[PDB]
Design a protein around this ligand. Structure first.
Ligand SMILES: *[C@@H]1O[C@H](CO)[C@@H](O[C@@H]2O[C@H](CO)[C@@H](O)[C@H](O)[C@@H]2O)[C@H](O)[C@H]1NC(C)=O
Ligand code: NAG
Lengths: 32, 24, 48
């Protein structure tokens, strides 16, 4: 209530390749 | 109300799959 | 107890290994730790 949003997406089974930093943070990802 | 414009996700929407710490 | 070969049963993970202190950077939601060849490497003590 009051007196640039709603970006809805649907997920699907996909293989992903993720790059983990030396600290476990996910710095990058590429689809497959 | 609302609009239904379409945009691109780019490199976005990626969470941690499991709870295993991983490095390099 | 640390610095000795001890049979551990951490949260269902049975095995035998030398336990000691480490300087990982386990994030708040992380429990296990594995390698490239998928072996349980570092385990965050549940009560420590
Ligand atoms: C992973 O986490 C380490 C510990 O939090 C980081 O080491 C620190 O680095 C900062 C500067 O980046 C120093 O100010 C601090 O004293 C400590 O050495 C390490 O950098 C970090 N690695 C990353 C973010 O890639
Ligand atoms: C486990 O529970 C005991 C009793 O409440 C508490 O003293 C101890 O700090 C707890 N350990 C952790 C890591 O939560």
């Amino acid at each position: 209530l009051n007196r640039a949003d709603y970006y809805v997406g649907y997920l699907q089974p996909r293989t992903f390749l993720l790059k983990y930093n030396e600290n476990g943070t996910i710095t990058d990802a590429v689809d497959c | 109300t609302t609009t239904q414009s379409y945009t691109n996700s780019f490199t976005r929407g990626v969470y941690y799959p499991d709870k295993v710490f991983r490095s390099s | 107890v640390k610095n000795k070969c001890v049979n551990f049963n951490f949260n269902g993970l049975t095995g035998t290994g030398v336990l000691t202190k480490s300087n990982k950077k386990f994030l708040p939601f992380q429990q296990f730790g594995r390698d490239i060849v998928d072996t349980t490497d570092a385990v965050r003590d549940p009560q420590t």
